[PDB]
Design an enzyme around this catalytic site. Structure first.
Site, PDB file in Angstrom:
ATOM      1  CG  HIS A  46       9.080  -3.975   2.241  1.00 26.51           C
ATOM      2  ND1 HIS A  46       7.859  -4.546   2.565  1.00 26.51           N
ATOM      3  CD2 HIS A  46       8.628  -2.783   1.321  1.00 26.51           C
ATOM      4  CE1 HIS A  46       6.864  -4.285   1.480  1.00 26.51           C
ATOM      5  NE2 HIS A  46       7.247  -3.216   0.875  1.00 26.51           N
ATOM      6  CG  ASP A  97       7.905  -6.760   5.048  1.00 27.96           C
ATOM      7  OD1 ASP A  97       8.176  -5.602   5.655  1.00 27.96           O
ATOM      8  OD2 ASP A  97       7.190  -6.642   3.776  1.00 27.96           O
ATOM      9  N   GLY A 196       2.673  -0.148  -3.452  1.00 25.33           N
ATOM     10  CA  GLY A 196       2.029   1.072  -2.817  1.00 25.33           C
ATOM     11  C   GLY A 196       0.954   0.342  -1.716  1.00 25.33           C
ATOM     12  CB  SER A 198       3.830  -2.291   0.690  1.00 22.98           C
ATOM     13  OG  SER A 198       4.512  -3.263  -0.069  1.00 22.98           O
TER      14      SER A 198
HETATM   15  C1  LIG Z   1      11.346  -6.597  -3.041  1.00 21.06           C
HETATM   16  C2  LIG Z   1      11.021  -4.934  -3.099  1.00 21.06           C
HETATM   17  O1  LIG Z   1      10.455  -4.653  -1.942  1.00 21.06           O
HETATM   18  C3  LIG Z   1      10.437  -3.489  -1.498  1.00 21.06           C
HETATM   19  C4  LIG Z   1      11.369  -2.513  -0.805  1.00 21.06           C
HETATM   20 CL1  LIG Z   1      12.559  -3.527  -0.065  1.00 21.06          CL
HETATM   21  C5  LIG Z   1      10.939  -1.393  -0.673  1.00 21.06           C
HETATM   22  C6  LIG Z   1      10.023  -0.544  -1.331  1.00 21.06           C
HETATM   23  N1  LIG Z   1       9.861   0.894  -0.834  1.00 21.06           N
HETATM   24  C7  LIG Z   1      10.961   1.685  -1.137  1.00 21.06           C
HETATM   25  C8  LIG Z   1      10.624   3.233  -1.259  1.00 21.06           C
HETATM   26  C9  LIG Z   1       9.657   3.486   0.119  1.00 21.06           C
HETATM   27  C10 LIG Z   1       8.690   2.489   0.046  1.00 21.06           C
HETATM   28  C11 LIG Z   1       9.199   1.043   0.123  1.00 21.06           C
HETATM   29  C12 LIG Z   1       9.054  -1.415  -1.928  1.00 21.06           C
HETATM   30  C13 LIG Z   1       9.055  -2.645  -2.212  1.00 21.06           C
HETATM   31  N2  LIG Z   1       8.567  -3.329  -3.006  1.00 21.06           N
HETATM   32  C14 LIG Z   1       7.555  -2.886  -3.908  1.00 21.06           C
HETATM   33  O2  LIG Z   1       7.779  -2.129  -4.415  1.00 21.06           O
HETATM   34  C15 LIG Z   1       6.211  -4.207  -4.166  1.00 21.06           C
HETATM   35  C16 LIG Z   1       5.484  -4.278  -3.325  1.00 21.06           C
HETATM   36  C17 LIG Z   1       4.491  -4.937  -3.346  1.00 21.06           C
HETATM   37  C18 LIG Z   1       3.563  -5.133  -2.227  1.00 21.06           C
HETATM   38  C19 LIG Z   1       4.084  -5.432  -4.839  1.00 21.06           C
HETATM   39  O3  LIG Z   1       2.978  -6.276  -5.106  1.00 21.06           O
HETATM   40  C20 LIG Z   1       3.085  -7.709  -4.658  1.00 21.06           C
HETATM   41  C21 LIG Z   1       1.896  -8.058  -4.081  1.00 21.06           C
HETATM   42  N3  LIG Z   1       1.194  -8.989  -5.195  1.00 21.06           N
HETATM   43  C22 LIG Z   1       5.064  -5.190  -5.749  1.00 21.06           C
HETATM   44  C23 LIG Z   1       4.834  -5.574  -7.308  1.00 21.06           C
HETATM   45  C24 LIG Z   1       6.237  -4.277  -5.538  1.00 21.06           C
END
Ligand SMILES: CCOc1c(Cl)cc(N2CCCCC2)cc1NC(=O)c1cc(C)c(OCCN)c(C)c1
Length: 247
Positions: A46, A97, A196, A198
Protein backbone atom coordinates in the site's frame (compact mmCIF):
# COMPACT_ATOMS: atom_id res chain seq x y z
CA UNK A 1 5.97 5.03 16.59
CA UNK A 2 3.82 6.37 19.48
CA UNK A 3 5.85 5.97 22.71
CA UNK A 4 8.89 3.60 22.87
CA UNK A 5 12.46 4.99 22.47
CA UNK A 6 14.79 6.51 19.97
CA UNK A 7 17.37 4.02 18.61
CA UNK A 8 20.14 3.88 15.96
CA UNK A 9 20.67 1.75 12.89
CA UNK A 10 23.24 -0.54 14.69
CA UNK A 11 20.31 -1.79 16.80
CA UNK A 12 18.14 -2.46 13.75
CA UNK A 13 20.66 -3.12 10.97
CA UNK A 14 18.03 -4.64 8.61
CA UNK A 15 15.72 -1.55 8.59
CA UNK A 16 15.53 0.15 5.15
CA UNK A 17 14.40 3.80 4.74
CA UNK A 18 12.45 4.24 1.50
CA UNK A 19 11.97 7.68 -0.08
CA UNK A 20 10.25 9.09 -3.19
CA UNK A 21 11.77 11.75 -5.45
CA UNK A 22 9.47 14.32 -7.06
CA UNK A 23 9.63 16.46 -10.20
CA UNK A 24 11.32 19.61 -8.91
CA UNK A 25 13.92 17.69 -6.94
CA UNK A 26 12.20 17.28 -3.58
CA UNK A 27 12.50 13.83 -1.88
CA UNK A 28 9.97 12.64 0.69
CA UNK A 29 9.97 9.67 3.10
CA UNK A 30 7.53 6.93 2.03
CA UNK A 31 7.70 3.87 4.33
CA UNK A 32 10.07 1.58 6.08
CA UNK A 33 11.42 -1.77 4.87
CA UNK A 34 13.48 -4.74 5.98
CA UNK A 35 16.58 -6.14 4.28
CA UNK A 36 15.94 -9.89 3.76
CA UNK A 37 18.85 -10.60 1.45
CA UNK A 38 21.63 -8.39 0.12
CA UNK A 39 19.59 -7.55 -3.07
CA UNK A 40 16.07 -7.69 -1.63
CA UNK A 41 14.09 -5.35 0.68
CA UNK A 42 10.55 -6.35 1.74
CA UNK A 43 7.89 -3.77 2.56
CA UNK A 44 4.14 -3.09 2.07
CA UNK A 45 2.33 -2.76 -1.24
CA UNK A 46 0.00 0.00 0.00
CA UNK A 47 3.11 2.21 0.24
CA UNK A 48 3.65 2.12 -3.49
CA UNK A 49 0.30 1.18 -5.12
CA UNK A 50 -0.47 4.80 -6.27
CA UNK A 51 3.05 5.37 -7.58
CA UNK A 52 4.35 2.02 -8.95
CA UNK A 53 7.19 3.68 -10.91
CA UNK A 54 10.34 2.04 -9.52
CA UNK A 55 12.35 4.91 -10.97
CA UNK A 56 10.80 7.36 -8.40
CA UNK A 57 12.31 5.54 -5.40
CA UNK A 58 15.41 5.71 -3.20
CA UNK A 59 16.32 3.10 -0.54
CA UNK A 60 18.79 3.79 2.25
CA UNK A 61 20.41 1.15 4.41
CA UNK A 62 22.58 1.84 7.42
CA UNK A 63 20.61 5.04 7.99
CA UNK A 64 19.57 6.35 11.48
CA UNK A 65 18.34 9.84 10.66
CA UNK A 66 15.50 10.96 8.42
CA UNK A 67 16.98 13.92 6.59
CA UNK A 68 20.67 13.76 7.17
CA UNK A 69 23.59 11.38 6.43
CA UNK A 70 24.61 8.60 8.81
CA UNK A 71 28.12 7.17 8.67
CA UNK A 72 28.31 3.86 6.81
CA UNK A 73 24.96 4.35 5.07
CA UNK A 74 24.45 3.11 1.48
CA UNK A 75 22.10 4.45 -1.24
CA UNK A 76 20.21 2.23 -3.63
CA UNK A 77 17.95 2.55 -6.65
CA UNK A 78 15.09 0.19 -7.15
CA UNK A 79 15.90 -2.26 -10.02
CA UNK A 80 12.67 -4.17 -9.60
CA UNK A 81 9.43 -3.03 -7.72
CA UNK A 82 7.15 -6.00 -7.18
CA UNK A 83 3.66 -5.52 -5.71
CA UNK A 84 1.35 -8.35 -4.64
CA UNK A 85 -1.17 -8.94 -7.48
CA UNK A 86 -4.04 -9.68 -5.07
CA UNK A 87 -3.45 -6.57 -2.97
CA UNK A 88 -6.59 -4.70 -2.03
CA UNK A 89 -7.83 -2.29 0.62
CA UNK A 90 -11.12 -1.98 2.43
CA UNK A 91 -12.27 0.74 4.88
CA UNK A 92 -9.63 -0.35 7.35
CA UNK A 93 -7.92 -3.54 6.24
CA UNK A 94 -5.22 -3.98 3.60
CA UNK A 95 -5.01 -7.45 2.13
CA UNK A 96 -1.85 -9.09 0.79
CA UNK A 97 -0.07 -5.93 1.83
CA UNK A 98 3.49 -7.05 0.93
CA UNK A 99 6.06 -5.87 -1.64
CA UNK A 100 9.62 -6.62 -2.77
CA UNK A 101 12.13 -4.00 -3.80
CA UNK A 102 15.15 -5.32 -5.59
CA UNK A 103 17.93 -2.85 -4.88
CA UNK A 104 21.22 -1.73 -6.49
CA UNK A 105 23.87 0.83 -5.72
CA UNK A 106 24.74 3.24 -8.53
CA UNK A 107 27.79 0.94 -9.16
CA UNK A 108 25.43 -1.96 -9.91
CA UNK A 109 25.83 -3.88 -6.61
CA UNK A 110 23.59 -5.37 -3.87
CA UNK A 111 23.94 -4.49 -0.19
CA UNK A 112 27.41 -4.93 1.42
CA UNK A 113 26.98 -6.12 5.04
CA UNK A 114 28.67 -4.23 7.85
CA UNK A 115 27.99 -3.51 11.53
CA UNK A 116 25.08 -1.24 10.40
CA UNK A 117 23.69 -3.30 7.53
CA UNK A 118 22.63 -6.90 8.07
CA UNK A 119 19.81 -9.11 6.77
CA UNK A 120 16.83 -10.23 8.90
CA UNK A 121 15.81 -13.89 8.84
CA UNK A 122 12.46 -15.00 7.48
CA UNK A 123 10.15 -17.14 9.54
CA UNK A 124 9.33 -20.76 8.59
CA UNK A 125 5.93 -21.69 7.12
CA UNK A 126 2.97 -20.97 9.44
CA UNK A 127 5.46 -20.69 12.35
CA UNK A 128 4.71 -17.70 14.59
CA UNK A 129 5.39 -16.92 18.18
CA UNK A 130 2.53 -17.59 20.59
CA UNK A 131 0.24 -14.74 21.64
CA UNK A 132 1.59 -12.71 24.55
CA UNK A 133 5.12 -12.84 23.03
CA UNK A 134 6.96 -9.53 22.98
CA UNK A 135 8.23 -8.29 19.62
CA UNK A 136 9.80 -5.02 18.50
CA UNK A 137 8.84 -2.57 15.72
CA UNK A 138 11.02 0.16 14.18
CA UNK A 139 10.09 3.22 12.15
CA UNK A 140 10.29 6.91 11.30
CA UNK A 141 6.55 7.13 11.62
CA UNK A 142 4.58 9.78 13.50
CA UNK A 143 5.19 10.15 17.29
CA UNK A 144 1.61 11.40 17.94
CA UNK A 145 -1.42 11.19 15.67
CA UNK A 146 -1.62 15.01 15.56
CA UNK A 147 1.87 15.44 14.13
CA UNK A 148 2.21 16.30 10.50
CA UNK A 149 5.92 15.72 10.24
CA UNK A 150 7.90 12.57 11.00
CA UNK A 151 10.65 12.30 13.70
CA UNK A 152 14.21 12.97 12.61
CA UNK A 153 15.57 10.11 14.61
CA UNK A 154 14.71 6.41 14.07
CA UNK A 155 12.51 4.85 16.78
CA UNK A 156 11.56 1.50 18.25
CA UNK A 157 9.14 0.02 20.74
CA UNK A 158 8.06 -3.35 22.08
CA UNK A 159 4.52 -4.56 21.62
CA UNK A 160 2.74 -7.80 22.43
CA UNK A 161 1.39 -10.27 19.99
CA UNK A 162 -2.43 -10.49 20.21
CA UNK A 163 -4.45 -13.65 19.51
CA UNK A 164 -6.74 -13.80 16.44
CA UNK A 165 -9.53 -14.57 18.90
CA UNK A 166 -9.10 -11.24 20.74
CA UNK A 167 -8.41 -9.36 17.49
CA UNK A 168 -11.64 -10.49 15.81
CA UNK A 169 -14.03 -9.46 18.51
CA UNK A 170 -16.67 -6.87 17.45
CA UNK A 171 -15.16 -4.01 19.46
CA UNK A 172 -11.70 -4.80 18.02
CA UNK A 173 -11.79 -5.59 14.28
CA UNK A 174 -14.47 -8.25 13.83
CA UNK A 175 -13.81 -10.38 10.76
CA UNK A 176 -11.74 -7.54 9.19
CA UNK A 177 -8.57 -9.26 10.47
CA UNK A 178 -7.85 -12.46 8.54
CA UNK A 179 -5.52 -15.43 9.10
CA UNK A 180 -2.91 -13.82 6.82
CA UNK A 181 -2.65 -10.94 9.30
CA UNK A 182 -1.25 -10.57 12.81
CA UNK A 183 -2.20 -8.06 15.60
CA UNK A 184 0.17 -6.64 18.17
CA UNK A 185 -0.40 -3.90 20.75
CA UNK A 186 0.64 -2.50 24.13
CA UNK A 187 -1.58 -3.93 26.89
CA UNK A 188 -1.98 -0.39 28.19
CA UNK A 189 -2.57 1.10 24.77
CA UNK A 190 0.35 3.43 25.27
CA UNK A 191 2.75 2.62 22.45
CA UNK A 192 2.05 1.63 18.82
CA UNK A 193 3.06 1.90 15.16
CA UNK A 194 1.51 4.93 13.39
CA UNK A 195 1.36 6.59 9.98
CA UNK A 196 4.82 6.39 8.36
CA UNK A 197 5.70 3.10 10.12
CA UNK A 198 4.11 1.09 7.30
CA UNK A 199 6.28 -1.31 5.45
CA UNK A 200 8.71 -1.68 8.35
CA UNK A 201 9.44 -4.76 10.52
CA UNK A 202 7.76 -6.50 13.35
CA UNK A 203 10.74 -8.49 14.70
CA UNK A 204 10.17 -11.45 17.09
CA UNK A 205 12.99 -13.34 18.81
CA UNK A 206 11.96 -16.81 17.68
CA UNK A 207 13.77 -19.99 18.66
CA UNK A 208 17.00 -18.22 19.34
CA UNK A 209 16.77 -16.09 16.24
CA UNK A 210 15.74 -12.56 15.15
CA UNK A 211 12.84 -13.14 12.79
CA UNK A 212 10.68 -11.10 10.49
CA UNK A 213 7.30 -11.97 11.90
CA UNK A 214 5.44 -8.95 10.55
CA UNK A 215 5.33 -5.93 8.23
CA UNK A 216 3.51 -2.89 9.46
CA UNK A 217 0.16 -2.82 7.65
CA UNK A 218 -2.86 -1.09 9.11
CA UNK A 219 -4.85 0.00 12.12
CA UNK A 220 -7.60 2.25 13.46
CA UNK A 221 -5.72 5.34 14.62
CA UNK A 222 -2.54 4.96 16.72
CA UNK A 223 -2.40 3.59 20.32
CA UNK A 224 -6.23 3.53 20.61
CA UNK A 225 -7.82 1.22 23.17
CA UNK A 226 -9.09 -2.00 21.49
CA UNK A 227 -7.47 -1.04 18.21
CA UNK A 228 -4.20 -3.01 17.80
CA UNK A 229 -1.64 -2.43 15.03
CA UNK A 230 -2.22 -4.92 12.23
CA UNK A 231 0.77 -6.56 10.45
CA UNK A 232 1.16 -8.82 7.41
CA UNK A 233 1.83 -12.41 8.56
CA UNK A 234 5.02 -12.94 6.66
CA UNK A 235 4.95 -16.68 7.59
CA UNK A 236 1.94 -17.03 5.27
CA UNK A 237 3.67 -15.49 2.22
CA UNK A 238 6.87 -17.61 1.84
CA UNK A 239 5.83 -19.11 -1.53
CA UNK A 240 5.12 -15.64 -2.79
CA UNK A 241 8.48 -14.31 -1.51
CA UNK A 242 10.52 -17.27 -2.81
CA UNK A 243 8.82 -17.08 -6.21
CA UNK A 244 9.79 -13.45 -6.88
CA UNK A 245 13.18 -13.62 -5.16
CA UNK A 246 14.58 -16.62 -7.06
CA UNK A 247 15.19 -14.38 -10.11
C1 LIG B 1 -6.09 2.90 4.65
C2 LIG B 1 -4.94 3.83 4.37
O1 LIG B 1 -3.77 3.07 3.95
C3 LIG B 1 -2.75 3.78 3.36
C4 LIG B 1 -2.62 3.88 1.97
CL1 LIG B 1 -3.70 3.03 0.92
C5 LIG B 1 -1.59 4.65 1.42
C6 LIG B 1 -0.71 5.33 2.24
N1 LIG B 1 0.36 6.10 1.69
C7 LIG B 1 0.11 6.94 0.51
C8 LIG B 1 1.20 7.98 0.36
C9 LIG B 1 2.57 7.33 0.26
C10 LIG B 1 2.79 6.36 1.41
C11 LIG B 1 1.63 5.38 1.52
C12 LIG B 1 -0.86 5.23 3.62
C13 LIG B 1 -1.87 4.48 4.19
N2 LIG B 1 -2.04 4.34 5.58
C14 LIG B 1 -1.77 5.24 6.53
O2 LIG B 1 -1.61 6.41 6.30
C15 LIG B 1 -1.64 4.69 7.91
C16 LIG B 1 -0.81 3.59 8.12
C17 LIG B 1 -0.64 3.06 9.39
C18 LIG B 1 0.26 1.88 9.62
C19 LIG B 1 -1.32 3.66 10.46
O3 LIG B 1 -1.18 3.12 11.72
C20 LIG B 1 -1.94 1.95 12.02
C21 LIG B 1 -1.09 1.06 12.91
N3 LIG B 1 -1.60 1.09 14.31
C22 LIG B 1 -2.17 4.77 10.26
C23 LIG B 1 -2.91 5.39 11.42
C24 LIG B 1 -2.31 5.27 8.98
Amino acid sequence: IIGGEFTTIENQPWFAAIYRRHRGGSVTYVCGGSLISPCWVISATHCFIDYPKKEDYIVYLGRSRLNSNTQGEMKFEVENLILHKDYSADTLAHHNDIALLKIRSKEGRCAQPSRTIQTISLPSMYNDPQFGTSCEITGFGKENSTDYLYPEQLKMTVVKLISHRECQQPHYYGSEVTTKMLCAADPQWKTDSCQGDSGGPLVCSLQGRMTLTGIVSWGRGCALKDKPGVYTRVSHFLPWIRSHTKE
